[PDB]
Amino acid sequence: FEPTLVVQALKEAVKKLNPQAQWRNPVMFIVWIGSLLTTCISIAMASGAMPGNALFSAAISGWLWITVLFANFAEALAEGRSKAQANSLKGVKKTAFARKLREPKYGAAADKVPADQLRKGDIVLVEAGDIIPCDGEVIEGGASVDESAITGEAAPVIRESGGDFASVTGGTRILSDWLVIECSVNPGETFLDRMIAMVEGAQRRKTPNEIALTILLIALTIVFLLATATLWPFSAWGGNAVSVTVLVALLVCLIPTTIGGLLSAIGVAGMSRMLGANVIATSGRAVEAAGDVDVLLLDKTGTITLGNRQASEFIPAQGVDEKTLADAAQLASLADETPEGRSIVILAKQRFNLRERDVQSLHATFVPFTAQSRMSGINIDNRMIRKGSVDAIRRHVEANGGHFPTDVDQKVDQVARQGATPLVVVEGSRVLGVIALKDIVKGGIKERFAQLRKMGIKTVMITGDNRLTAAAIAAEAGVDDFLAEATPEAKLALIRQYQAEGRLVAMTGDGTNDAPALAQADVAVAMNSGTQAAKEAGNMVDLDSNPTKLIEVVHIGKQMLMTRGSLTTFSIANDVAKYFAIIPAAFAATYPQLNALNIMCLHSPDSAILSAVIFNALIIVFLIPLALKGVSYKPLTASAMLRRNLWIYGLGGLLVPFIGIKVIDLLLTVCGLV
Amino acid sequence: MAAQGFLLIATFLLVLMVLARPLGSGLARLINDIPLPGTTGVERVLFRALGVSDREMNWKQYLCAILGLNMLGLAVLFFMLLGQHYLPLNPQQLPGLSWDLALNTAVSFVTNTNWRSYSGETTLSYFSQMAGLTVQNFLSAASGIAVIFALIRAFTRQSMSTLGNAWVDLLRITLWVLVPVALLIALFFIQQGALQNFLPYQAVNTVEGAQQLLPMGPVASQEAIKMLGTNGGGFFNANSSHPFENPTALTNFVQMLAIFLIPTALCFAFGEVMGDRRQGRMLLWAMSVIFVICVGVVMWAEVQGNPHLLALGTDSSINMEGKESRFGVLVSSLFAVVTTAASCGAVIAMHDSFTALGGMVPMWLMQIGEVVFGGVGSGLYGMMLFVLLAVFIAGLMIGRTPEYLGKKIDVREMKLTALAILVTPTLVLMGAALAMMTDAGRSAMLNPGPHGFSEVLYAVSSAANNNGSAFAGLSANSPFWNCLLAFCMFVGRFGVIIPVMAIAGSLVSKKSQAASSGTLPTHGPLFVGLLIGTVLLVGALTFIPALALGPVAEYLS
């Protein structure tokens, strides 16, 4: 709403005021043709052959032109903000320079170029520190990239020449290696550019719901065009006919011009606001599908795991003490630099203030976490202390000439009853014990799932564990339906099961393994860390790589729909008060008897209609902030949200026009224009 | 008084509900296509003999069956009225209705309107009444109920493409529902004092030298069916106030119960068929709250009445100008709101002479779309168009996509709903404009000024909503009014019936998802609120301009 974008959308409105560009909004088109008709009547009055009082019809036609200009302005402003958001996302890519090689082989003098001018035939170098400016193919050498822009988990990946890693994207951040690529004009590796070009042009697909709402507004416009136009025969029978200017004013005022004008601004505002939430929509259809999703398959990992499981119970293999058990578990886990080992050591210190170990116990050989041994430990004593999984520890004690006592396995079965994946510690060749590591929910998610449950969106977990631990975690999180040993085809089967009932399905899945489900899904937030084959499945594309973001995409969906409905009611209701401002002050010369309906005590007929029209235009420009920042809403239950939006905007549409029209009339009288 | 008006309303509604729940289950059994308890042998032999069979109909064929039947009814009726001087049962040799009046009466009675510009006792012989008007009363009401049966089956079916066959529904509605209950109400009136005979007009030498010529005819049969089927076309001119059509206060009460018997029974049957009765109750609560507030307004306006009567010298300002005397103002007022709310169209107190405000409310309940307990069948499906509108708005301000009874509502229902809702405002307003411009149109008033225009607006408003009521001063016998009102009634009824069936055809190909925990109940005080709100707001917004120059301007006069 800042000056620059305001003036630019104002000039856009004036340039979109011509008729050939508003066929496509019959409510605004009736306001436009009305405005034209009354300016013609005004000119005729001002110098020519008509009854008289040129001003009042010129002032009515001027304010109707302002109403058209404000509708065009609201839409231009929404689109301007959308373009700003799109160009800012592309400007995340435009923050990068580009080093172009003179000779294609690695090692040469390169010049820095902004990351947009690289075209077909160029051979560019990207070394450690810079951002990859543009796409292309790797021809020589090998680097590790972080895909930071096209991947929000920062996991590294090696990119070598002469292999399957010759597909290079643009905007990401490079690591401490180097890469020689050839810029190409093949299809890119970003789904950003695609929508960026989509919305930047002059096109927008009406969404089903916004076609239904337009069908409603058009029915309202026909009903009121017929009423206000058939006022002319009735009046003309009863006395001196109603003017044509007062009738065009009554027609424009009644017509739902508020939601009429703002409809398109609301659509593009919802898209821009989601874009602000970092997800790249594909079309309004997908946003309103988001608004309708009755189930979202949030996979456990990502949001309900909160990193990795941490210890919960101490289980001794030798009846050992919990203090010495936690001391030996942390001692052995110091060599496990993964988050799991750090969490085990932290929970040990926290549980029994076993905090530090001096250097004298040090001068050891640390066993790092390894895939081949599947065990970590410390060889402080002449025996080897170890820590690993249950299967690898059983296989290594059987390989290390030891044995696992039966009580250890029985307690492991107890941990299996608990639903926690058991970790085992072994000292030398005799097992020391098992520690139960139950995974935590995100901590602040049961409430959001409760709110969704209220709105009517049954969360659904999808995990790879068994149907006992999965139920445990389900109840732990506040989800409804849970799957064990989640296999992609089974995920697709569940998706079609939930679609058959009519319910839409929401989903977050990276990687081609979930591609068919995503395509089958209705709102598929393909995470921006996965393969381009998965992003292209589409219907949504994230950028923060937060699978919880789907929740926000549903808030934005229902915000957009709530805005449409709420303003619709606001406009229909609004007409009730415009009747009391116009009817008794349009017929105050034909039927004197009708002054008693002038309840607002408006000053004079002429002032009454000029004031109703002025309030019509000022409502369309006062409600922009709301039609662009969406209708704030807390997730109350469906009936109570109906009751809140009927109270707020039903009495918006009765009590606000009274104050509106009477204040504009009051202002006009004071200034002395009537 | 009004202490003893509210009793009248309470007893009327209570008795209407007691009588309606049973018959509501009756029509539930018909909608489900299950033989009404005793008639399966008869249904079978009869359908086999006729040619109707088990084969069902998709929306196109159902619609075309009902429209073929109605249009054929129109052809035979227009030809009866246009040649009744060649048919028997002429007690007084009467001429064949002219072309314009024939067309108007025919189109009126085929489309359940029963508008009446003629004078039944001097213009129609018996044969036309007995086997013209009454037969088309039966078939217009059976068509209305066959269309609401198609709609309700559309809501309660899933993934089918057939709305059950139209000839079976017409035969079961007529033979089982209407003929018995109408033969019973007709024996009741023939006791109370109505007349049911074919004697020639009987002479009368009054106790004074003067002399009069009582009419006669088959009046009680046509009464039972003109009420029960919410028609209005009674035999005589002052149809339901003539002491030969509605003789004592008790038959007046049976006629109000009959005017609402089938619309309310249909609401309860609709509640049943869906398995969740609360939908039916929801509908009745909306329609009842509107009707009760309306009857409050009217009873009050009348009991205030014409103040000139109190100044001019009379004894109480009560407005007994039009009203009958066997009925008070309380019962005549309740019968004006009942007759015009339900699209029955049987006036019991000439609606012209109601105090301005007293006449706005019936006139308004007609212009609203004949929603509140509307005509046989027309009530429910017109109400349901407003319910789809309200469901749409609610779904739109909940985030959900619109839903009613589990079936989504996409644009193909929205277009059809907007058109069906449009069909009657557009007719009444365009018609009122045409009448008030053409000279013939506005040379058929009786009262001048505001109320003079009110007569024209109410005549067109009744006709295009299929009401049949009329301000009765408006001389609607001139060929202009016949053709205008004929076209209005025709397009009113059939223009609503075609989109309703398109809606049913498009709602039978869906699948009704279950009721999740986040779908707004369509049953309860807040949705009945939002339904009343949608109906009243749309009606008021459309018609307060037209009504500000008719009744209101007269009231404030």
Partner: peptide
């Protein structure tokens, strides 16, 4: 009827034609 009234009737019918046309389309 008269110049003004015929132009008015024609224009209202034109706008109703355009509106119903929009109500029967997705524009």
């Amino acid at each position: 009827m008269s110049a003004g009234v015929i132009t008015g009737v024609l224009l209202v019918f034109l706008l109703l034609g355009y509106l119903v046309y929009a109500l029967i389309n997705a524009e």
